[model samples]
Target: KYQKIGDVVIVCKAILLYTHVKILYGKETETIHKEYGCLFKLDVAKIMWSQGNIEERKRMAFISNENEVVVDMFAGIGYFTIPLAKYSKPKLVYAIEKNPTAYHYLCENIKLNKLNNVIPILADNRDVELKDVADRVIMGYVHKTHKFLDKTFEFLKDRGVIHYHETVAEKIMYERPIERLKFYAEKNGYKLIDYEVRKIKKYAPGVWHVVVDAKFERI
Candidate 1:
């Protein structure tokens, strides 16, 4: 992926670049990118935006039912938050983001989309005052997302669905997330109702980025 920022271009490469392209086509990294009938304003140089996740975003917009209370644990620039609020028309969406820069865009996108149901919460989702109220929870962060499964259950209703994102080795792409969800649910007193895993994108040569739709009920 290449991002143009103020007459300078940044390319995603394995090593440093010694040569420069001297072409002044544009000079702005900040712009509005629209998709699925929603607008997202972000700085390409500062924030990471993936076009590969477009399909996943569309899936979320149609997954939640109207009037459902949703909590986005790692809402980066309203990735899933705006779609849920604008398309699904959820009763309320508590969007939580810890990064200040990303949080700024998140709030901006919320207003830009004119979504009144989305409530932006700029704080670590664990520190925020969210409890067993959400009908659905979104954990869109990878790497350490599994560590926060306990918190997901804490803020979730007696029965709800969780969209968990993770990057796993190709060999265990499906089993890993499912096993982790089952372990966490059982350990947290939540019964595993059902779950399905879908490959979102290829993160690396031997790794796969996936999302698991897991539904559970409090035991």
Candidate 2:
């Protein structure tokens, strides 16, 4: 499938992995992509921008309370961060990204969108020295995202909300993802107040990408 970022039409090698794009026309991969009145600058060659997540990003735009602190754990070019910061009226957002190449755009997107609420961090989401501040945390990445769950409460304030995202097979779907979080919540002295799961897209034929919006409080 092909998607255009600015002037570059990038064709994905496959849907399972969003990397390795074959550029159809434009030589320069650097361009601006706009959606929901927010701006993001990225190199199509370096970052895999998923148009499929547009709905998820859009849903998060107005999901937070006024002046609350939100953290985008894998804030790729402010995909969710930009819109969240733009519309949610957040007091602050820790836009954390581990990759240097992607990190650069994360910072740029913050500036490009004319936002000061986001503190763009260029390190693994967990390595950062912040804790117990987030009112809402966005774990928008798939695959390895669940492995980082245990650390979520370390930075999440009591009663904070987590938009935990994961890649699940059809057989497992909502059960495994919520159960996974519940397993850790019990082990880590956290209580799941309420949880709701929603599918983002189909990763493969039987596998699905989904997010669970759950509120947790530490005991």
Candidate 3:
């Protein structure tokens, strides 16, 4: 298993036993990676920077307005957060990351990018107290992302958008995630104004990681 981090390449010794795979280049795991006109410094071995999500990150950069306030529930190493702060130039971006290692880099990236609008919150998003203030909320985590819909709805303005992401089976890719968002919107007594689904990348063979831009209004 070889890993490529920024400019550094890591070759797992266990992956190749007999083959003579010598270190041909740099051994440094820490490096700078630039994407969509944003800069990020990270240790590849300590954290993950998914190249597959590049499109999604670019999409995020264009989604915000200058006056909007954003809250990123699972802001990992300023993945979507940095681009939003830089390109979109949102009024404020509250980036919450629980992982200490990731959080450190997230803060570093914010400063490295010369962003003053991003507020890095080092805490579990669930315990963080935020209410009806955000113009848009980003739920960038998969797996248990749906479980935090209640908290997300609470943080969003009466009329706002939610960038909800999830890992779904290829068969029910579009239908399942849309229905899931509708369920939460209805449960929270919010009307779904408009919704759109975009496939980010394939998480596994038959599973896709997708994002849903669900706009809602109080009913």
What lDDT tens digits, residue by residue, belong to model 3 across residues 171-215?
Answer: 998898888888888888887898888888889999999988999
The runs of at least 3 residues in candidate 3 whose Cα sits more than 4 Å from the true structure, single-residue gaps closed, are 1-4, 11-28
The local distance difference test score of each candidate is 0.84, 0.83, 0.85
Q: Lowest-lDDT window of 10 residues in candidate 1?
A: 12-21
lDDT of 2 by residue, 1-219 (tens): 757676566543222212455544435668788887998898878887777888988999999867699888888788888898889879998888999999999888888989978899899877876778988889988867778877787778877989998888989887998888888888878889999989889899999998999999997
Q: Which candidate is the best by lDDT?
A: 3
- Positional deviation of residue 34's Cα in model 3 after best superposition, in angstroms: 1.9
Best by TM-score: 2
Candidate with better TM-score, 2 vs 3: 2
Model 2 earns a TM-score of: 0.90
Identify the runs in model 2 with alpha carbons over 4 angstroms from their true place.
Answer: 11-26
lDDT (10s digit) by residue, model 1, range 1-219: 554332335553222111223323454566677777888888765776776888989988878878699999999899899988888898999999999999999989999999889899889888987879999999998868889998998998999999999999999987988889988998888988988889988999999999999899999
For model 2 the local lDDT of residue 4 reads 60
Q: Model 2: which residue pairs collide?
A: none
Residue ranges of candidate 1 with Cα displaced over 4 Å: 1-27
Summed backbone clashes in each candidate are 0, 0, 0
